[PDB]
C-alpha cells in the first residue's frame, strides 16, 4: 500500500499548487490517459486524499514556515503547556457535551417508551 499512498501524496502535492478549483494539475491528467481512481469522491481513499490536500494547503500557510518563523511553539514550553491544557479542556467539554447528548437521548427513549400509542386521532 506504499505505492498508492505515494501516488496520493503526489496528487495532493500537485493539486495544492493550483490557482483555481477546477484548473489543477490533476484535472488535465485525467484527460491525458492517466488512470486515477482516487480523484472520484465515491472511493474510500478520497476522504484520505482530501485530508492530505488539506494538510498540503496548511503546509503552505505564511506561519507554516514559508516566509515566517514560529517563536511561541518553538521557543516557549509554557505556551505549549497552555495549548495542551486548552486542548484537554476542549476534550473535557466535548466529553461533557457527548454525555449530555447521551442523557438527552436516554430521556427521549424513556419518554417514547412510556407514551400511549392507542390514542389515535385522524384529522
Amino acid at each position: 500500500s506504499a505505492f498508492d499512498l505515494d501516488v496520493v501524496k503526489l496528487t495532493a502535492q500537485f493539486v495544492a499548487r493550483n490557482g483555481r478549483q477546477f484548473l489543477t494539475q490533476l484535472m488535465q491528467k485525467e484527460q491525458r490517459n492517466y488512470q486515477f481512481d482516487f480523484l472520484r469522491p465515491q472511493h474510500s481513499l478520497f476522504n484520505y486524499f482530501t485530508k492530505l490536500v488539506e494538510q498540503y494547503t496548511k503546509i503552505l500557510i505564511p506561519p507554516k514556515g514559508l516566509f515566517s518563523k514560529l517563536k511561541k511553539e518553538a521557543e516557549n514550553p509554557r505556551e505549549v503547556l497552555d495549548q495542551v491544557c486548552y486542548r484537554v479542556e476542549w476534550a473535557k467539554f466535548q466529553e461533557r457535551e457527548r454525555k449530555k447528548e447521551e442523557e438527552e437521548k436516554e430521556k427521549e427513549r424513556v419518554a417514547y417508551a412510556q407514551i400511549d400509542w392507542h390514542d389515535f386521532v385522524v384529522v
Binding site: 447521551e102 437521548k105 436516554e106 427521549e108 427513549r109 417514547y112 417508551a113
Partner: protein, 160 residues
C-alpha cells in the same frame, strides 16, 4: 478442519449420503458427518463434509454458498439485541453491513456457534449505539425478509 467444510441450513430432506452426493461435483468428499440431537434424535441442520484436498473444500465453500437446498439456506464455510433464525451464509462483517442501514453499530457483532462444529448455532447478539436504533430494528428488522430465512429481532434485557 481445514480440509473439511461445515455446512449449515439443512432441512429434513437432506441426509448424510445426500450431502456427499451433492458435494461430489465440487470435489472428492471422503466422508460426511451429521451430529444427531439428544431430544429429537435427528440432525440439527448443521453438518460436516471432510474432503481429500483443501482446494476442493474451498471450491465447495465458494460454489455452494447461500444455496437453496431442500427449501433451506444451505451454505458451506471453513470449519442489547438478540437475533434468532439467522442464515449461516452471512458473516460478522455482512451482519454489520446489514445492521448499518437501520442504525449505527457500537462495535463488531458476534454470532453464537456450536461447541462441536463451530460454524453457526442459530442465534446472534448485536448491540446498537442508542435505543432508537434498537427500536428501528425491532420495528423494521424484526420480521424482514433475509436470505431465505425469517429472522426475529428481540430485546435481550428489558426492565419493567
Amino acid at each position: 478442519q481445514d480440509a473439511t467444510v461445515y455446512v449449515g441450513g439443512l432441512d429434513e430432506k437432506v441426509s448424510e449420503p445426500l450431502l456427499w452426493e451433492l458435494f461430489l461435483q465440487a470435489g472428492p468428499v471422503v466422508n460426511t458427518h451429521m451430529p444427531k440431537d439428544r431430544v429429537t434424535g435427528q440432525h440439527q441442520g448443521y453438518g460436516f463434509v471432510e474432503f481429500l484436498s483443501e482446494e476442493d473444500a474451498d471450491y465447495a465453500i465458494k460454489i455452494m454458498n447461500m444455496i437453496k437446498l431442500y427449501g433451506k439456506p444451505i451454505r458451506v464455510n471453513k470449519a442489547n439485541i438478540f437475533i434468532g433464525n439467522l442464515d449461516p451464509e452471512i458473516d460478522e462483517k455482512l451482519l454489520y453491513d446489514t445492521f448499518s442501514a437501520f442504525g449505527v453499530i457500537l462495535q463488531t457483532p458476534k454470532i453464537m456457534r456450536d461447541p462441536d462444529t463451530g460454524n453457526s448455532k442459530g442465534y446472534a447478539f448485536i448491540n446498537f449505539a442508542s435505543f432508537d436504533a434498537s427500536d428501528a430494528a425491532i420495528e423494521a428488522m424484526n420480521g424482514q425478509y433475509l436470505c431465505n430465512r425469517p429472522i426475529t429481532v428481540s430485546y435481550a434485557f428489558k426492565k419493567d
